[PDB]
Structures are given as structure tokens and as C-alpha cells.
Design a protein around this ligand. Structure first.
Ligand SMILES: OC[C@H]1CNC[C@@H](O)[C@@H]1O[C@@H]1O[C@H](CO)[C@@H](O)[C@H](O)[C@H]1O
Length: 314
């Protein structure tokens, strides 16, 4: 293998990236997208704000651009995300009770129908749980609808799309902890009761030098519930600027994560949350942090590139 795509392809796994369709007009970004990945997810274009800016009025141009990109380049298309507390339009926040439930259901139905037969898997529900265990405490869905909204969303998604893989996705659930235990309890419950649910996403927004040592064990216990698992938003952030020590640790960290996936038969693969440090979400959220991706801000391969290649077994 001379690309990450080749390494993943050879391994029988997915290696994906989060796409901003506007950056496709930057030829270097498109060149790397085209050649280094076999899966794509929309970083932002398929979220609720991006798709339903006013009630029952849909804006699918950006999401369609991502889907068309996947079809044109022969990549698997991963759907993110139908139900998420963050960036919810004010019109939806202003609804309550049955009116809010119906807006959620309509959102799930219309977005899943629109992309049916293109999107292979959906993050149906994103970030439902709380660090330290139990349900998230600043969620419009949890607050307005209570515990049952997750099941409602999954059933609505399956009603719309009979065959898509339906995933629940979260962060800080990579190790075995109160948060991933709560997630585990739900997955086991849903499978026990025949609630549509096929996969679990582990975002893996990690800090350099801090990869959970029990990540493989955790992925395995989820797979053993009878669902597929996926590393969905991998990046590994450091204090900037980078230096040789930090880049080496980061490479070792990327290898640890990709190996944990390789070690679990039902781990579908690994998606990194962007291509280049140039565009990464990290610096805007965590001042003085960044350099979290596989390519730097000038599109030079970092040591993480070789590590990922090696981990896929190339
Ligand atoms: O915040 C980083 C990611 C956490 N897990 C869910 C992903 O959707 C997040 O992506 C970021 O979403 C933000 C809000 O939509 C957006 O401003 C950033 O561009 C995304 O990377």
C-alpha cells in the first residue's frame, strides 16, 4: 500500500473522512479526498440546521453535494446525524410536547427518505449520554421528550429506510466508564426488545498521550451484543505548535486506535474528523490546541500517516 485507502481496502475495512463540500473546489483537498479514503461522511451538511432551516422546509443542496461526491468516487456514504441536541434551529427549540415530537419524527423521516439508497448507515442519535453516566443534561430532546425519544427516533428511521444501518454515536465512550456503561445498557436493551439498531459509533476525539487502554475490550463487548462498531470522528489533539515528540506520540496514538479496531472483527473501520489541520474544528473550541489530524495545514503527511498505514496492516 502507498495510500491509506489501499491499506484499509487491503484490510477489508473502511477508512473515511469528514467532508466539507465547499472545500472540494480546493484541488489539493479534493486530491487527498479522492485518493486516501474509501468512505465519506458530511462534517456539517446533513445536520438538522443544514437540512431543515425552517419547519418542514428542507435544504438538501449541501448534503446532496456530499452524496454525489461519494457516488462519483465510489466511496461508502455515512450519514451524520438525524437527532442531536447541538445546533438545533430556534424554530425547533421553540416547540414543545407532541409538536416537538412530531418535528423530530418528521425530520428523521424526511432526511432518511431523501437519502435512502445513498446513505448506507446513519448516526440516528448523537451524544445522548452524559460524562459520568446517565442521560445528557443540556438536550432539547431529553428535556422535552424524556427517555423514550431515542427509541422513537430509531423506529422512525427504520420506518423510512428499511435497510440502512442505524447507529447511535457518542464521545468519551471509548473506555469502559459510567458513560459507555449507560450506552451499553441501552444497546443491550434495544437488541433484547427488537428495537432497530445495528451499530455503535465511538467518536474518538482524543488528546495526545491519552488513548484508553481498554478501547479494544470496550469495542468487543459492544460487538458481542450483536451490533457493528465504528470509530467515527477520530482526531488526536495536542497543544500547538507541534514538535517532534508530540507528533511521534500522536502517531503512536493513531496506531493504537486503528489497531483496536483491527482487533475487533465487527469494527467496520475508522473515520477521521477531517483531512487537514488547516480546517479542523479543534482550535476554535479549545484555544491553544489543535494539530489533531493526519495532514498538516500545508497538506504535508504527518507521522500519523505511516502509523495508520501500519495499523491497517500495510
Ligand atoms: O465538535 C466536534 C464534533 C463532535 N461530534 C459531533 C460532530 O458533529 C462535531 O462536528 C462539529 O460540529 C460543529 C457543530 O455542528 C461544527 O461547527 C464543526 O465544524 C464540526 O466539526
Amino acid at each position: 500500500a502507498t495510500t491509506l485507502k489501499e491499506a484499509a481496502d487491503g484490510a477489508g475495512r473502511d477508512f473515511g473522512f469528514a467532508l466539507d463540500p465547499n472545500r472540494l473546489s480546493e484541488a489539493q483537498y479534493k486530491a487527498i479526498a479522492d485518493s486516501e479514503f474509501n468512505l465519506v461522511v458530511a462534517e456539517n451538511a446533513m445536520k438538522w440546521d443544514a437540512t431543515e432551516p425552517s419547519q418542514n422546509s428542507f435544504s438538501f443542496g449541501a448534503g446532496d453535494r456530499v452524496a454525489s461526491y461519494a457516488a462519483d468516487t465510489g466511496k461508502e456514504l455515512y450519514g451524520h446525524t438525524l437527532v442531536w441536541h447541538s445546533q438545533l434551529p430556534d424554530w425547533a427549540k421553540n416547540l414543545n410536547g407532541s409538536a416537538f415530537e412530531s418535528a423530530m419524527v418528521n425530520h428523521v423521516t424526511k432526511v432518511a427518505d431523501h437519502f435512502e439508497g445513498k446513505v448506507a448507515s446513519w448516526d440516528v442519535v448523537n451524544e445522548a449520554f452524559a460524562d459520568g453516566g446517565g442521560r445528557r443534561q443540556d438536550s432539547a430532546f431529553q428535556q422535552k421528550l424524556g427517555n423514550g425519544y431515542i427509541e422513537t427516533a430509531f423506529r422512525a428511521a427504520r420506518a423510512a429506510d428499511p435497510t440502512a444501518k442505524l447507529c447511535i454515536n457518542d464521545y468519551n465512550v471509548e473506555g469502559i466508564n459510567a458513560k459507555s456503561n449507560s450506552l451499553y445498557d441501552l444497546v443491550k436493551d434495544f437488541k433484547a426488545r427488537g428495537v432497530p439498531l445495528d451499530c455503535v459509533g465511538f467518536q474518538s476525539h482524543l488528546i495526545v498521550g491519552q488513548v484508553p487502554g481498554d478501547f479494544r475490550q470496550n469495542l468487543q463487548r459492544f460487538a458481542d451484543l450483536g451490533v457493528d462498531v465504528r470509530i467515527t470522528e477520530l482526531d488526536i489533539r495536542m497543544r500547538t505548535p507541534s514538535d517532534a515528540t508530540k507528533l511521534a506520540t500522536q502517531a503512536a496514538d493513531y496506531k493504537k486506535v486503528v489497531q483496536a479496531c483491527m482487533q475487533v472483527t465487527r469494527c467496520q473501520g475508522v473515520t477521521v474528523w477531517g483531512i487537514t489541520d488547516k480546517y479542523s474544528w479543534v482550535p476554535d473550541v479549545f484555544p491553544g490546541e489543535g494539530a489533531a489530524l493526519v495532514w498538516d495545514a500545508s497538506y504535508a503527511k504527518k507521522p500519523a500517516y505511516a502509523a495508520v498505514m501500519e495499523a491497517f496492516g500495510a
